[PDB]
Structure formats: structure tokens, C-alpha cells
Design a protein around this nucleic acid. Structure first.
Ligand code: CL
Ligand code: CL
Ligand code: MG
Ligand code: MG
Ligand code: MG
Ligand code: MG
Ligand code: MG
Ligand code: MG
Ligand code: MG
Ligand code: MG
Ligand code: MG
Ligand code: NA
Ligand code: NA
Ligand code: NA
Ligand code: NA
Ligand code: SR
Ligand code: SR
Ligand code: SR
Ligand code: SR
Ligand code: SR
Ligand code: SR
Ligand code: SR
Ligand code: SR
Ligand code: SR
Ligand code: SR
Lengths: 194, 92, 237
RNA sequence: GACUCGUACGGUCACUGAAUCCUGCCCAGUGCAGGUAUCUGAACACCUCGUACAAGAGGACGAAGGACCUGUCAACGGCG
RNA sequence: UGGAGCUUUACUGCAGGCUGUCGCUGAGGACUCUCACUCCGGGAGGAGGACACCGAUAGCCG
């Protein structure tokens, strides 16, 4: 039979419909009067969290992060530039808001490592994503069969090197075949053309 | 100069002389779905667009006749080289 | 070219800032819990650096000592009041509603509680005209009919220092001394006397703007100089 | 964020350059501003055609702007 | 078929301003309302209000 989780999932397929639409109208008012990075006791989207790797266990932290919507906040050139480079308004950054949110979340917790993240809506100017973070130095995590891999020294700051879920999709690594020529095994390796 | 709307002449299709009818070629509309159309969209962006930033040139003092010679029998038409003509009026 | 002077202004450097560390006090109205019952005594009269106008120091009952935007006529010993039940006399502060139509007021709030925004310069004053349960019409020093919330507080009377403008500076030195007390870069070099690189009207063998002086309002900073969005110019006609 | 512990007797932007006698005519062009029946005027949505869909073609509507009208020279300038 | 500074109704573009449209954004060609959002107030509350601000795009000026 359907799980209780499938219902949280179902509701979030259309966040502006039904009860949740009402719930969002509520919450966002509070979210707006909140910080840039706020630690929360429980994932807003349980199904998503558990699905991304979450666990009701010690050393597991969740945090909502707000980020401005829109293109890049770019400064206009202060020296000579050919027409092609005099651009300012339409320039967008190569990193998506969600990746930006994971990074800000991670700075707040210099000791935790990002395990994954997901969005929890947006208003006309913000964008909120909840970030699952893990404490690599806490046992109960070390001794955990599902997460202990994130304790490896190789995973120190995995987000800043784009080893996150969102990181890898953004990097163009989702496809194993056509179109991932200049993408895999890394952007930098392909002369940065992806 | 003036020119007869109809007159006998070689029809390359029937392969024999027939009475053709001359018509000035009317421009056909564009679909906007040609490669060049798609390239203008693909290659235009911030700053100058190279060739797509250029604009339609000038004109010559006199243009060459641009006509279609349609055969009165099989109904098909053929084109011919044109000759400069300040004006071209048909008779009848 | 180089940024024009009006652009150097914005960066807010020392040259363009006002000598705030030398200024006395914003003269925003005192706040009253309610039911008025707030009176004080004028302990002294002082010179307001920022406004070249006198201002009064008041000692209120609850022991609060503050400088007040003084109207003409306030003298030491006098007793001022602030609140709804305040007596309608010069120097008192009350909602535009409690003020009888036809009375000259000053230091008028734009929004109830802001502490006054309008009519605070020397000798000026706003004339209260119409009353109501929804709006109080005030006539501002510019001659504009302003519609204000009748709950907006104001002071009765005209601001002290009237006629300050009647006397000429006579010499540059006098001007100099006042300027040295405001957030203003002085003296002024006419743009038309500058190099083309420094201002729109610069350059040219002989001084004269090289364009008409009436600039569009959508002109970008750096280009917007001269007669901004002028509806007309000259005196003729 | 400066202006601003500022509020039109303010302070911003410009021209002229103490006092004295004065400062004529011109709004056609350009500039600014206001107005505007009608004309024109983009995208989204809408309608038609096309496409089992899409590209695309056309339509209706029509913002500021322009055409048009008016104001203005101690606006740019002009007074043969 | 050198460089730079400056000019402009040179060519091409880029900021900036104005204006429409989509999102934020809700209830009953024009209107009322409150609940988001905005501003004022120490606070209670007051003013405004689906506009504005902000994000995106389009036309004009530049
Ligand atoms: Cl990390
Ligand atoms: Cl002065
Ligand atoms: Mg197992
Ligand atoms: Mg003067
Ligand atoms: Mg000067
Ligand atoms: Mg010089
Ligand atoms: Mg020189
Ligand atoms: Mg210049
Ligand atoms: Mg001179
Ligand atoms: Mg001159
Ligand atoms: Mg050069
Ligand atoms: Na960290
Ligand atoms: Na690429
Ligand atoms: Na004229
Ligand atoms: Na140079
Ligand atoms: Sr580190
Ligand atoms: Sr492209
Ligand atoms: Sr372009
Ligand atoms: Sr020619
Ligand atoms: Sr104030
Ligand atoms: Sr205050
Ligand atoms: Sr000049
Ligand atoms: Sr005159
Ligand atoms: Sr003189
Ligand atoms: Sr004119």
C-alpha cells in the first residue's frame, strides 16, 4: 500500500494547489522574516529528505537557505571590451541557485559536509532550499552503514568541488552518452567547454 | 519599353513553339523556417551579431526584366536572362 | 570622459558630507503616551548650526531635556505643551485635528509620529485650512495644497529666524562661512568653463554650452545637467 | 548609501557675473514640456490559418514613443 | 589598412530612465475589499494595497 511518505511527495508535485498552497502562504511569511541559513529540526519534505539520504539520527542536520532569484548581479566593465563582452543584464551565472544555497549552508557549518538538498518553494524574490548536512566526526555516523562513506577524508568539502547531487547535474554529468563529451570526467579537464 | 503580353516562342517543355504569356515575377512570402532563419536566431546575442547586424544595401539605377514565360498549352513556364529596362509595360 | 561633479557627490566623501559631528539635534516632535498631560519649560535659546535658525531647549515634567524646533516668539521661562489636550497657543504641539482652521503651523508631520517633516526652515510656515474626520488640508510654504492625515502633529506658529534671506551675503567670505556648515561643495565652477572631458557643456574655443540646456528626464546621470526636464525657460511669455 | 541631526527663507541643476541705466523681435529647425479625435506603435494573453503537436503566416487590442497641436529663448540659436 | 584623448544627428553596441506584460498575487473596461507585500508608529494601531518594491521580458529615449 502507498506509504505515508508518498503523500508528502504527492502534495509537493503541485505546491500552489490544495492545502500546501495554503501552508506555503503561511510559512513563507515566517521564512521571509528569517536568516540566510536557518537550522531546522525536521525536513519540510520528509519523503525527499529520506530519499536523498536523510535519517532520524545524531550528526544529521537540516537547514533552510534563502537566495535571491534572477540573473547574475554583475558589475559593468571598467575598461575596454569588445561588444560581445559589454554585457551586463542578460548574463547569468553558471552555478544554479540551489548549488549556491548548498554552499552558503556549508559555510555556516564549517564542520559538516553537504549530503544533498532540495527546494521548498520560492516567492517573487527569494528561493528556498533545504540542505541535508552530515557531521563526519560523530560516531553513530561513522558506525552508520549508509552514511559512513561521507566520513572519508576524500569528501572534505565535497560541495565546493561540485561533488554534490546538484553539483553533478549542473556540471552536465547526467548523461553517460551523447552530449557529455566536454563534460565528463570534468569540466576543467575538457578545456572548460561544457 | 513595351512588350506583348502574349506571343509565340520556344517552349522548352513541349519542345516546340507555342503561344506563351509573359508575367512579371511576384515575390513569394517567406516561411521563416529556413536554415538561414534558424542561424540568425542561434547566432544573435549580446553585442554585434556579425552578418546579422548588417542592413540591406543600395540599388542600381536600372534593373533587369524579371519575367516568367508561361506556355499556353502545357501551362508550364520557363525563365530567361533579363535585360536592363527602366520600365516595362505589357500590351494587352 | 570623467564623471561630472554631481556624480562625485553621491559617493558621499568628506568633501560632500555635512559636518554632522558638529550638528546639535534633529528636532523631531517628542512622543506622548497619550491624553496629552505633557508640558515643559523653555530653559534656553540656542543657535541651530544646521539651519542658521534659533532653536529652544525645553525641560519637560518627566525630567526629559530636549531641543525643540522653535517658532517665533518662544522665550525662556515660557511653558510649552505637547498632546491632544494641549492649549492652542504659539509653541504648542498637537494633532492637525485639534488645531483650529486658519492657524499658522510649522514642523508638520508627513505621517503621524514621524516627528515633523514640513515647514522647518527660517520664517516659513504652513497654513492649516480644512478639517475633517478623514483629511486635513494644509497649505505648504511652496503654495501647494497638501492633504494630510488629521492625526499628523504640528506646532503652532511660524519658524523662528524670518527674513534671514532679506540681507545679502555681500562678500564671498560670508558665503564661505555658511557653506562650511552644510553638506555642500562650494564655490561653483560653471560647466561651460570646463574641459569637454569634465562636463557636457565643456570645451569649445569660446564658452557656451554646445547643446540646448533642457535635458530629458530619462537622461542618465552624467548627462543630466543644465535645465532638467524644464517645462519652460526664460521669463518672457 | 551621500545629500540629511536637512524640508521650499530648503537644496539640487545650470547660465550670467558688484553697483547704475537697461535687457528689443523670432517657437520655423533643434531641445525640453504638456496635450492629443484620428494615424502609427512591441511583447504576453486572445482569435484565424497551418501542423494529429511545433516551427510559421495573418488578425484584433494597443503602453510609453512618434505623426499632429500647443507652451517655452535670462533653451540651443537667429535677427539676411 | 600605427596609438591615445576628445566630439557628434559616423558605424555598432552597453549601462541608465520611461512604458507594457508575466511571476510575487489574494476575495467580491470599470469598481469594492483584505490576506500577501509596502510605508508610518515604542506599542496598540495607523496609511496603502494586490498596486508598488523585487525578479523576467518587450517598445521608446539613451
Ligand atoms: Cl561539503
Ligand atoms: Cl546659502
Ligand atoms: Mg541494509
Ligand atoms: Mg541667492
Ligand atoms: Mg560659478
Ligand atoms: Mg579651460
Ligand atoms: Mg585647453
Ligand atoms: Mg562629455
Ligand atoms: Mg563668459
Ligand atoms: Mg556664454
Ligand atoms: Mg585612434
Ligand atoms: Na564545512
Ligand atoms: Na557548452
Ligand atoms: Na523655434
Ligand atoms: Na591622447
Ligand atoms: Sr576546509
Ligand atoms: Sr547562441
Ligand atoms: Sr545583438
Ligand atoms: Sr545607386
Ligand atoms: Sr527626522
Ligand atoms: Sr525618528
Ligand atoms: Sr562647450
Ligand atoms: Sr521676452
Ligand atoms: Sr550689472
Ligand atoms: Sr519648438
Amino acid at each position: 500500500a502507498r506509504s505515508a511518505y508518498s503523500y508528502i511527495r504527492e502534495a509537493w508535485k503541485r505546491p500552489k494547489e490544495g492545502q500546501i498552497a495554503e501552508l506555503m502562504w503561511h510559512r513563507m511569511q515566517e521564512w521571509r522574516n528569517e536568516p540566510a541559513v536557518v537550522r531546522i529540526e525536521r525536513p519540510t519534505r520528509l519523503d525527499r529528505a529520506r530519499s536523498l539520504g536523510y535519517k532520524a539520527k545524531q550528526g544529521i542536520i537540516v537547514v533552510r537557505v534563502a537566495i535571491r532569484k534572477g540573473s547574475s548581479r554583475r558589475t559593468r566593465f571598467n575598461k575596454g571590451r569588445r561588444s560581445k563582452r559589454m554585457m551586463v543584464n542578460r548574463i547569468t551565472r553558471k552555478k544554479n541557485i540551489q548549488r549556491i544555497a548548498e554552499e552558503r549552508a556549508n559555510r555556516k557549518f564549517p564542520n559538516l559536509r553537504v549530503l544533498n538538498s532540495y527546494s521548498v518553494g520560492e516567492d517573487g524574490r527569494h528561493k528556498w532550499h533545504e540542505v541535508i548536512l552530515i557531521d563526519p566526526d560523530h560516531p553513530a555516523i561513522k558506525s552508520d552503514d549508509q552514511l559512513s562513506w561521507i566520513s572519508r577524508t576524500r569528501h572534505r568539502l565535497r560541495t565546493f568541488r561540485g561533488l554534490t547531487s546538484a553539483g553533478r547535474r549542473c556540471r552536465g554529468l547526467r548523461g553517460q552518452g551523447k552530449g557529455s563529451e566536454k563534460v565528463r570526467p570534468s569540466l576543467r579537464v575538457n578545456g572548460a567547454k561544457a | 519599353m513595351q512588350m506583348p503580353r502574349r506571343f509565340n516562342t520556344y517552349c522548352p517543355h513541349c519542345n516546340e513553339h507555342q503561344e506563351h504569356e509573359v508575367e512579371k515575377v511576384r515575390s513569394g512570402r517567406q516561411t521563416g523556417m529556413k536554415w538561414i532563419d534558424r542561424q540568425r536566431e542561434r547566432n544573435s546575442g549580446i553585442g554585434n551579431d556579425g552578418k546579422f547586424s548588417k542592413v540591406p544595401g543600395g540599388d542600381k539605377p536600372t534593373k533587369k526584366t524579371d519575367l516568367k514565360y508561361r506556355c499556353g498549352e502545357c501551362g508550364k513556364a520557363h525563365l530567361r536572362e533579363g535585360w536592363r529596362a527602366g520600365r516595362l509595360e505589357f500590351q494587352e | 570622459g570623467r564623471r561630472i561633479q554631481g556624480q562625485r557627490r553621491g559617493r558621499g566623501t568628506s568633501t560632500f558630507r555635512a559636518p554632522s559631528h558638529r550638528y546639535k539635534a534633529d528636532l523631531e516632535h517628542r512622543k506622548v503616551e497619550d491624553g496629552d498631560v505633557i508640558a515643559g519649560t523653555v530653559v534656553d535659546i540656542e543657535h541651530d548650526p544646521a539651519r542658521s535658525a534659533p532653536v529652544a531647549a525645553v525641560e519637560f515634567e518627566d525630567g526629559d531635556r530636549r531641543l525643540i524646533l522653535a517658532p517665533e516668539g518662544v522665550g525662556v521661562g515660557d511653558e510649552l505643551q505637547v498632546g491632544v489636550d494641549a492649549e492652542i497657543a504659539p509653541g504648542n504641539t498637537l494633532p492637525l485635528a485639534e488645531i483650529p482652521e486658519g492657524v499658522p503651523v510649522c514642523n508638520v508631520e508627513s505621517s503621524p509620529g514621524d516627528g515633523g517633516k514640513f515647514a522647518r526652515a527660517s520664517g516659513v510656515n504652513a497654513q492649516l485650512l480644512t478639517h475633517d474626520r478623514n483629511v486635513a488640508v494644509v497649505k505648504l510654504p511652496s503654495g501647494e495644497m497638501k492633504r494630510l492625515d488629521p492625526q499628523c502633529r504640528a506646532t503652532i506658529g511660524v519658524v523662528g529666524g524670518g527674513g534671514r534671506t532679506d540681507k545679502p551675503f555681500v562678500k564671498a567670505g560670508n558665503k564661505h562661512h555658511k557653506m562650511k556648515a552644510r553638506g555642500t561643495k562650494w564655490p561653483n565652477v560653471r560647466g561651460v568653463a570646463m574641459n569637454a572631458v569634465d562636463h557636457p557643456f565643456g570645451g569649445g574655443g569660446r564658452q557656451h554650452p554646445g547643446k540646448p540646456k533642457s535635458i530629458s528626464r530619462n537622461a542618465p546621470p552624467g548627462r543630466k545637467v543644465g535645465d532638467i526636464a524644464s517645462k519652460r525657460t526664460g521669463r518672457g511669455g
